[PDB]
Amino acid sequence: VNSFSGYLKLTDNVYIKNADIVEEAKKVKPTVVVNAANVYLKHGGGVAGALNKATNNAMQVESDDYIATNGPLKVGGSCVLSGHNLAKHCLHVVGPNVNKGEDIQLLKSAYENFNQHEVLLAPLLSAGIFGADPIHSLRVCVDTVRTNVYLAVFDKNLYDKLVSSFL
Numbered sequence: 157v158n159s160f161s162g163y164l165k166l167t168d169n170v171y172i173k174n175a176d177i178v179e180e181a182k183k184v185k186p187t188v189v190v191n192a193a194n195v196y197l198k199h200g201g202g203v204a205g206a207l208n209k210a211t212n213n214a215m216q217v218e219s220d221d222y223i224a225t226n227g228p229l230k231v232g233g234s235c236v237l238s239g240h241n242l243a244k245h246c247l248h249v250v251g252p253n254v255n256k257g258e259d260i261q262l263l264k265s266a267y268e269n270f271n272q273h274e275v276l277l278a279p280l281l282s283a284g285i286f287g288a289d290p291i292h293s294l295r296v297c298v299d300t301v302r303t304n305v306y307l308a309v310f311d312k313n314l315y316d317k318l319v320s321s322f323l
């Protein structure tokens with residue numbers, strides 16, 4: 157039993173809710189919140205900008221030190237950093253950004269990072285300003301993640317479309 161509330165169960169291990177991932181993280185304080193990161197951990201907009209804003213820019217400060225030490229992530233890769241006031245840990249995962257021409261096949265590799273964590277609160281990777289089809293992202297999530305994932309979808313219209321079209 158965990159504290160996630162109001163989710164629709166899609167599969168044995170994948171759950172979905174129309175929710176603001178920031179507000180959801182603040183309420184649940186999950187062990188792991190996933191950020192929709194880029195390789196530079198520049199949290200300017202989308203989910204990343206919103207999560208970083210909620211940390212009063214502490215996420216960005218920590219991220220800049222991480223990059224200065226380690227260099228950029230790979231597309232499809234991840235790193236574990238602090239969850240600040242939102243979660244114990246933040247798993248920064250880089251899905252391919254279609255508006256940069258990145259290969260969508262890398263979306264499966266991106267979701268594989270979730271399997272290193274037993275339970276996660278997450279957005280749909282490569283959705284939103286990353287330019288991929290969220291229906292495709294949900295399919296890859298379900299077919300790749302084996303650990304327990306609680307997906308937060310900000311847009312109610314998109315949420316309803318994702319549920320109604322889910323196979």
Ligand SMILES: O=C(Cc1ccc(-n2cccn2)cc1)OC[C@@H]1CCCNC1=O
Binds near residue numbers: 176177201202206285
């Ligand atoms: O960026 C996102 C994710 C997102 C993904 C897809 C869409 N989308 C709309 C139409 C088509 N796709 C919109 C948003 O979350 C925004 C965050 C989360 C909550 C806190 N404040 C924010 O701004």
